[PDB]
RNA sequence: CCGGGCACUCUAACGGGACUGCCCGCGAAAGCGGGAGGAAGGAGGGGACGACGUCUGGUCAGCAUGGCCCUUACGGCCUGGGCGACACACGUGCUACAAUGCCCACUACAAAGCGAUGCCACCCGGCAACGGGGAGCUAAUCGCAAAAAGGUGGGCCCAGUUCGGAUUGGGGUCUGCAACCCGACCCCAUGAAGCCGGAAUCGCUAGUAAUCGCGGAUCAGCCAUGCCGCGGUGAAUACG
């Protein structure tokens, strides 16, 4: 992105729940370009967010995402002297992306054998706040805690 | 019921041939239904550009057979004689049959 | 997987036909 | 229960649990299942000692298996060596028998690598 | 493999069928390693060619379906050290 | 007696016949949901219906060939887009901001010698 | 290639397996197009001067 | 399929079409942003295209060609061998280590190319490779053809396994004068390492990367996982 401000890919909203953030999440379950698998997995998750939980699975999603969204993180800057770790808050765009990603990555670490139950339970456990994907969020905000020392080098 | 099959490697002369046979027939006789392009069949060669070894860097070429069909329903002995003697093709090929 | 010649996937990949990928249509 | 040699398979499926015998698998399994007329989708755990004896007695009798099979493949190889033949040398020296290439990876038949200097 | 087949070069198949009914048998050198061996080859001593020279090979009955070149190896090894 | 449109996405070609009725849709002599049964994006084929509010106003006769199931679908989308705009072409009004009147120029980029897939390049070595 | 080689390629008999395409400009055995009877270097050479009928360099 | 029309799809030639030509903003202009156009904008995406020169770059083994050199041989023909060797070391790749996965069944949707010294429908024999028969096509007119992933249904239940198919034993098929060295393919058996890979390191900015299949050139056959192409599905992310 030498010349450009490198503008963002605009995603076609969902078919069923009618939302951009779903599709953006769908894509992240998609190994090797299979969307069918992606959505048939994801949608089966809400099948599981239902007979299991009484709430309204879309609402879980928008919340578990908001819980997993990192408020500040630590990236690096080269200065006179060493390369440092500087705390900055994550852009709105980046919050989203990181959240979507951890969601899945934690999700596929859980032991439960079938794909859609992993995303079910993680998206549940995330919503309620006790998620492994949320550990990462906290743990990232925690790194920005420690280096609040070098906070004066931010751009 | 007599059909003419046209081939050649250049469509600039091919079409210019099929055009002549149209009024070597139309004006010159019974009804002959206009020139219909058949799909082009393409032989292609992709070859290494230099004599020794540079295996990326290939030039490629193609040889294109273009086909042009024209049908003739009803025979006139002026159409026939025109289509025999009055031939003005060059690198174009031509065929005909009763069936 | 594509390397088991004793299955449909193998045979296809190898381009061949046999008891594990019989020719029919 | 146990078929030729000892070879106890168990639980699982039946037509699968038959592979676990030396000399048998896939095909030879799905075969003896309908030639003793037994359901393959049944699990060796449960079934009549009847369908068990039909099953053992067929297999053990039709073709040769772990004990005598191994010793038969054994004896073939012995014959290939000591006759002096070329397939025999490649058994003698532990190297690949059917074409292929020893300048690089033969590993399965060469062992782990034994590095040397340059 | 072949079967409607079983190929043997006529060169030695001659001199072998010959060494059966002659009553006498001795040392015979062929360049034919492509051929197959036996039954009337057995007991004979043939010298096959590896590209370099003719190697004597004594013929017995479990050498049967094998080509002659199997008993006359082309390379030379003896390892590295 | 009916209305028509043309659409194509990526080597797939769609012919769309729109005549009014219950809203029954037919694809290649098949109920829409038999031919496309069990495919996520199928119902996005007719957006501009719902977008122009004609719901159970039109039946559909559609033929389609070329490309693959999922590109055919966006091709049918341009059919409905273009057909609907034949009947009362004030429907330009809300179609084009939704984008439904544009054809997707996006296709397979070719393959290039010395490359692998046409962008994808052979692994660098240096040694 | 050498002469006896460009030659022997034409004396085709004895076991028709041994016959092999050799280019009719070079003597070149490798990469000889069946159509032209030309090796890959000559076909690029003749195609360029317009001496190959209806043969143009493509692109797309 | 027939009558019938070519309207549409398409086929393949010829033109059209976007030029920052219009509007507001900036600006001295060139341009820059933004707008509404329209299928398309700010060179629409992709080719072909590679300055004076550089690397005493590459190639006397495609060819040509100065000089040197061999002349019953440094030339020429053959049979066989070798280029395929294996303690090891590197590059580029294919297949994986599995449950967004494997198997079986049923069921869909492509493009580009090849073929009457060939491609081979359909019937029969064979578990099969294949072999008998045998029609159509000088080929948008018949054939290669099944596209695969996908879809539906059923099974496997986390196991070195219905993962993975390396190795090896036996049995055959086809080409070819001939498959020991050195072939490809089918079947039965065998089932190895492998549970995401140290230091290190490659590609990719959109119809791309991943992933799935298909054709062709060479070619008797084939060690193709290679190469040159074709379309199916189809992300992520660029503060800077
Ligand atoms: Mg397997
Ligand atoms: Mg087109
Ligand atoms: Mg592709
Ligand atoms: Mg390369
Ligand atoms: Mg010369
Ligand atoms: Mg040859
Ligand atoms: Mg040749
Ligand atoms: Mg230019
Ligand atoms: Mg130099
Ligand atoms: Mg020789
Ligand atoms: Mg080599
Ligand atoms: Mg070898
Ligand atoms: Mg490879
Ligand atoms: Mg182990
Ligand atoms: Mg060999
Ligand atoms: Mg495991
Ligand atoms: Mg690795
Ligand atoms: Mg071939
Ligand atoms: Mg291929
Ligand atoms: Zn040449």
Swiss-Prot record, chain A:
Gene3D superfamilies: Ribosomal protein S7 domain. PROSITE patterns: RIBOSOMAL_S7 (PS00052). Signal peptide: none annotated. It comes from the Bacteria. Pfam families: Ribosomal_S7. One of its GO terms (molecular function) is structural constituent of ribosome. Keywords: Ribonucleoprotein, Ribosomal protein, RNA-binding, rRNA-binding, tRNA-binding. InterPro entries: Ribosomal_uS7, Ribosomal_uS7_bac/org-type, Ribosomal_uS7_CS, Ribosomal_uS7_dom, Ribosomal_uS7_dom_sf. GO terms for biological process: translation. GO terms for cellular component: small ribosomal subunit. Belongs to the universal ribosomal protein uS7 family. One of the primary rRNA binding proteins, it binds directly to 3'-end of the 16S rRNA where it nucleates assembly of the head domain of the 30S subunit. Is located at the subunit interface close to the decoding center. Binds mRNA and the E site tRNA blocking its exit path in the ribosome. This blockage implies that this section of the ribosome must be able to move to release the deacetylated tRNA. NCBIfam families: rpsG_bact (TIGR01029). Part of the 30S ribosomal subunit. Contacts proteins S9 and S11. Binds to the C-terminus of IF3 and to the C-terminus of Era. This is Small ribosomal subunit protein uS7. The lineage of its organism: Bacteria, Thermotogati, Deinococcota, Deinococci, Thermales.
Swiss-Prot record, chain C:
It comes from the Bacteria. Residues 1-25 are annotated as: Disordered. Belongs to the bacterial ribosomal protein bTHX family. Transmembrane segments: none annotated. GO terms for molecular function: rRNA binding. This is Small ribosomal subunit protein bTHX. NCBIfam families: PRK14753.1, ribo_THX. Keywords: Ribonucleoprotein, Ribosomal protein, RNA-binding, rRNA-binding. One of its GO terms (cellular component) is ribonucleoprotein complex. It comes from Thermus thermophilus (strain ATCC 27634 / DSM 579 / HB8). Binds at the top of the head of the 30S subunit. It stabilizes a number of different RNA elements and thus is important for subunit structure. Part of the 30S ribosomal subunit. Residues 1-12 have a biased composition (Basic residues).
Swiss-Prot record, chain D:
One of its GO terms (cellular component) is cytosol. Keywords: Ribonucleoprotein, Ribosomal protein, RNA-binding, rRNA-binding, tRNA-binding. GO terms for biological process: translation. It holds the Pfam family Ribosomal_S13. It comes from the Bacteria. The keyword Transmembrane helix does not apply. InterPro entries: Rbsml_uS13_C, Ribosomal_uS13, Ribosomal_uS13-like_H2TH, Ribosomal_uS13_bac-type, Ribosomal_uS13_CS. One of its GO terms (molecular function) is structural constituent of ribosome. The keyword rRNA-binding applies. Residues 94-118 are annotated as: Disordered. Transmembrane segments: none annotated. Located at the top of the head of the 30S subunit, it contacts several helices of the 16S rRNA. In the 70S ribosome structure it contacts the 23S rRNA (bridge B1a) and protein L5 of the 50S subunit (bridge B1b), connecting the top of the two subunits; these bridges are in contact with the A site and P site tRNAs respectively and are implicated in movement during ribosome translocation. Separately contacts the tRNAs in the A and P sites. PANTHER family: 30S RIBOSOMAL PROTEIN S13/40S RIBOSOMAL PROTEIN S18, SMALL RIBOSOMAL SUBUNIT PROTEIN US13M. Part of the 30S ribosomal subunit. Forms a loose heterodimer with protein S19. Forms two bridges to the 50S subunit in the 70S ribosome, contacting protein L5 and the 23S rRNA; these bridges are straddled by the 5S rRNA. Belongs to the universal ribosomal protein uS13 family. NCBIfam families: uS13_bact. This is Small ribosomal subunit protein uS13.
Swiss-Prot record, chain E:
The keyword RNA-binding applies. GO terms for molecular function: rRNA binding; structural constituent of ribosome. Gene3D superfamilies: 30s Ribosomal Protein S19, Chain A. InterPro entries: Ribosomal_uS19, Ribosomal_uS19_bac-type, Ribosomal_uS19_CS, Ribosomal_uS19_SF. GO terms for biological process: ribosomal small subunit assembly; translation. GO terms for cellular component: cytoplasm; small ribosomal subunit. Keywords: Ribonucleoprotein, Ribosomal protein, RNA-binding, rRNA-binding. Part of the 30S ribosomal subunit. Forms a loose dimer with protein S13. Belongs to the universal ribosomal protein uS19 family. Located at the top of the head of the 30S subunit, extending towards the 50S subunit, which it may contact in the 70S complex. Contacts several RNA helices of the 16S rRNA. HAMAP family: Ribosomal_uS19 (MF_00531). This is Small ribosomal subunit protein uS19. It comes from Thermus thermophilus (strain ATCC 27634 / DSM 579 / HB8). The lineage of its organism: Bacteria, Thermotogati, Deinococcota, Deinococci, Thermales. The gene is rpsS.
């Amino acid at each position: 992105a030498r010349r450009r401000r490198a503008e963002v890919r605009q995603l076609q909203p969902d078919l069923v729940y009618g939302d951009v953030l779903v599709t953006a999440f769908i894509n992240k379950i998609m190994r090797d370009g299979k969307k069918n698998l992606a959505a048939r997995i994801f949608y089966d998750a809400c099948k599981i967010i239902q007979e299991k939980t009484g709430q309204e699975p879309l609402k879980v999603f928008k919340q578990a995402v908001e819980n997993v969204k990192p408020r500040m993180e630590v990236r690096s800057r080269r200065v006179g002297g060493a390369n440092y770790q500087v705390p900055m808050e994550v852009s709105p765009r980046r919050q989203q992306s990181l959240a979507l990603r951890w969601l899945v990555q934690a999700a596929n670490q859980r032991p439960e054998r079938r794909a859609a139950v992993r995303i079910a339970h993680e998206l549940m456990d995330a919503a309620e706040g006790k998620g492994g994907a949320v550990k990462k969020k906290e743990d990232v905000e925690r790194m920005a805690e420690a280096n609040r020392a070098y906070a004066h080098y931010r751009w | 019921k007599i059909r003419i099959k046209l081939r050649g490697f250049d469509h600039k002369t091919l079409d210019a041939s099929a055009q002549k046979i149209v009024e070597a027939a139309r004006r010159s006789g019974a009804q002959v239904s206009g020139p219909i392009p058949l799909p082009t069949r393409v032989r292609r060669f992709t070859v290494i550009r230099g004599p020794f070894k540079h295996k990326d860097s290939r030039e490629h070429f193609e040889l294109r057979t273009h086909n042009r069909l024209v049908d003739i329903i009803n025979p006139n002995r002026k159409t026939i004689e025109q289509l025999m003697t009055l031939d003005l093709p060059t690198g174009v090929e031509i065929e005909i049959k009763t069936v | 997987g594509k390397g088991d010649r004793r299955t449909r996937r193998g045979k296809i990949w190898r381009g061949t036909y046999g008891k594990y990928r019989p020719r029919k249509k | 229960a146990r078929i030729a040699g000892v070879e106890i398979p168990r639980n699982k499926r039946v037509d699968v649990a038959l592979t676990y015998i030396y000399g048998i698998g896939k095909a030879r399994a799905k075969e003896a299942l309908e030639k003793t007329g037994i359901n393959p989708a049944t699990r060796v755990k449960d079934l009549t000692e009847a369908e068990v004896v039909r099953l053992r007695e067929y297999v053990e009798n039709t073709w040769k298996l772990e004990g005598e099979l191994r010793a038969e493949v054994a004896a073939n190889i012995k014959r290939l060596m000591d006759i002096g033949c070329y397939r025999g040398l490649r058994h003698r020296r532990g190297l690949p028998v059917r074409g292929q290439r020893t300048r690089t990876n033969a590993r399965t038949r060469k062992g782990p690598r034994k590095t040397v200097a340059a | 493999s072949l079967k409607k087949g079983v190929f043997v070069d006529d060169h030695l198949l001659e001199k072998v069928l010959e060494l059966n009914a002659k009553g006498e048998k001795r040392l015979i050198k062929t360049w034919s390693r492509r051929s197959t061996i036996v039954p009337e080859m057995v007991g004979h001593t043939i010298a096959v060619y590896n590209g370099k020279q003719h190697v004597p090979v004594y013929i017995t009955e479990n050498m049967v379906g094998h080509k002659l070149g199997e008993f006359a190896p082309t390379r030379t090894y003896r390892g590295h050290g | 007696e009916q209305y028509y449109g043309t659409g194509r996405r990526k080597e797939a070609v769609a012919r769309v016949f729109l005549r009014p009725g219950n809203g029954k849709v037919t694809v290649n002599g098949q109920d829409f949901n038999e031919y496309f049964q069990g495919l996520v994006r199928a119902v996005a084929a007719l957006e501009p219906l719902r977008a122009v509010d004609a719901l159970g106003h039109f039946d559909a006769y559609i033929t389609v060939r070329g490309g693959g199931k999922s590109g055919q679908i966006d091709a049918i989308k341009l059919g409905i887009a273009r057909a609907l705009v034949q009947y009362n072409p004030d429907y330009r009004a809300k179609l084009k901001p939704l984008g439904f009147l544009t054809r997707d120029a996006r296709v397979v980029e070719r393959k290039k010698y010395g490359k692998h897939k046409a962008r994808r390049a052979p692994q660098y070595s240096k040694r | 290639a050498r002469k006896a080689l460009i030659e022997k390629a034409k004396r085709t008999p004895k076991f028709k397996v041994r016959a092999y395409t050799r280019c009719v400009r070079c003597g070149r055995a490798r990469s000889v197009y069946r159509f032209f009877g030309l090796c890959r270097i000559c076909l690029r050479e003749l195609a360029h001067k317009g001496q190959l009928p209806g043969v143009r360099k493509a692109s797309w």
